[PDB]
Amino acid sequence: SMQELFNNLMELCKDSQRKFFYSDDVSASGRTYRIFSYNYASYSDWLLPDALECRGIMFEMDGEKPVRIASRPMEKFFNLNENPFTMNIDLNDVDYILTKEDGSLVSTYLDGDEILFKSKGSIKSEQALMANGILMNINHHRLRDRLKELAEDGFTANFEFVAPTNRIVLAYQEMKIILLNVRENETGEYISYDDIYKDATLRPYLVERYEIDSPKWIEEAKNAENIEGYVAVMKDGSHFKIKSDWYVSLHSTKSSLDNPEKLFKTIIDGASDDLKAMYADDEYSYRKIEAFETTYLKYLDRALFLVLDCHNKHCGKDRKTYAMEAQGVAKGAGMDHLFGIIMSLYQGYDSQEKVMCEIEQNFLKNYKKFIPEGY
């Protein structure tokens, strides 16, 4: 049930903000929403109860009790051969593929009498607000009506928001929203592509589908240029993706496999999953990347706890006493480089998020000492 899904999601957020977390938002109409997201997660984490649904699902809240699922974005999915979820896949079970658009996901939710958009982790991000602005345009009033009724019926429409001012890798000329899929809030089931295709009002915004009879599209995707790739939809409705080496080589940034600082940066940027899949045929590289991932997740858990714990437990005391406790915790953990971050938490950080960004940047300066043994 909806309450059971909510309980499992709250259970995932107990660990640390490094993994699964939630955040409360208030819309212009004053309604209270709780979004469940994530930062870094290993295969083992994705195996936890309903963890795959912890990437953007939103509930309208009444205190700590959920009233309804306001928005249901897609479940987390991965690149082919990225981890056990997408290994040993029967490629002949691929139903069809879709153009993988390169922007930012925006998902609908009904707010009072208004149909609005939310980005991955916020209802007021820059993409979310710009997306809302588009839906207000008279040239999209028929779509707006369509989306509003869907939402009042318990369905979430997921779009890729693209724009020249929202460039990731691909260069889009105009700002627009491309319809990717429509998911039922309560069950998580998707309306078939065909059913969406049937609606002449929606078709113009619908992402392009390519029918499939063989897996030849895969190697062609990997070797293509000027495209990110495609999202495959299986006979059972599940997804997996194929990104071109060209796209990943630009998204990764530089020479990750030849420079530990750059590899760690890729991991921090959340792009090592693509890199890992790209080198799936290169066992050494694939596993090397995993080792750095594991090393980074382990460090982040430890560092985050250490800094937050020390601040919480000694924030009240004076500066000298605090500094001594900070020195103690830092020194007593081979984490001497964290003293500065701890000293900065005394006057607090704009969020357990700000703290995490300083830790990430600070890690890139002291990366040398954490390179996994053997590399």
Ligand X SMILES: Nc1ncnc2c1ncn2[C@@H]1O[C@H](COP(=O)(O)CP(=O)(O)OP(=O)(O)O)[C@@H](O)[C@H]1O
Catalytic machinery residues = 100
- Asked if 356 and 270 count as a contact pair (C-beta separation under 8 A), the reply is no
Size of the site for Mg ion (CB under 5 A): 2
Residues in the interface with Cl ion (CB under 5 A) total 3
Residue from 84, 112, 237, 270 touching Mg ion (CB under 5 A): that is: 270
Q: Is 76 annotated as a binding residue?
A: yes
Residue nearest ligand X (C-beta atom): 105
Cα 302 from chain centre: 22
> Angle at CA 166, nearest 5°, toward 151 and 70?
20
The response to whether 142 counts as a known ligand-binding position is: no
Query: Per rule CB under 5 A, is residue 28 in the interface with Cl ion?
Result: yes
Buried-state track 178-194, b at ≥16 Cβ within 10 A, e below 16: bbbbbbbbeebebeebe
Site string for ligand X, 251-270 (x = CB under 6 A): -------------------x
Structural tokens at position 176: 């627009």
183 is in an annotated binding site: no
- Residue 50 interaction partner, one of ligand X, Mg ion, Cl ion, none, beta carbon < 5-8 Å per kind: none
Tokens of 128: 């979310």
Query: Least CB distance from residue 20 to Cl ion, whole Å?
Result: 17
For residue 7, CA distances in Å to 11, 26, 64, 290 come to 6, 21, 11, 31
Per-position x/- string for 101-120, each x denoting binding to Cl ion as judged by CB under 5 A, each - no binding: ----x---------------
Choose the stretch contacting Mg ion; rule: CB under 5 A; options: 13-21, 153-161, 196-204, 262-270.
262-270
Annotated binding residue at 331? no
Distance linking the first and last C-alpha atoms of the chain: 47
- Work out whether strand 176-184 and strand 209-211 pair parallel, antiparallel, or are unpaired: unpaired
Spatial contact of 251 and 271, defined as CB atoms under 8 Å apart: yes
Within 88-117, the residues that bind ligand X by CB under 6 A are 98, 100-101, 105
Member of 17, 27, 37, 156 binding Cl ion (CB under 5 A): 27
> Counting contacts by CB under 6 A, is residue 360 touching ligand X?
no
How many CB atoms sit inside 10 A of residue 299's CB? Answer: 19
Angstrom distance (rounded) from CA 123 to CA 116: 8
Is the Cβ of residue 9 or residue 180 nearer to Cl ion in the bound state?
180
55 labeled part of a ligand binding site: yes
| Residues in binding site | 38, 55, 76, 160, 241, 243, 273
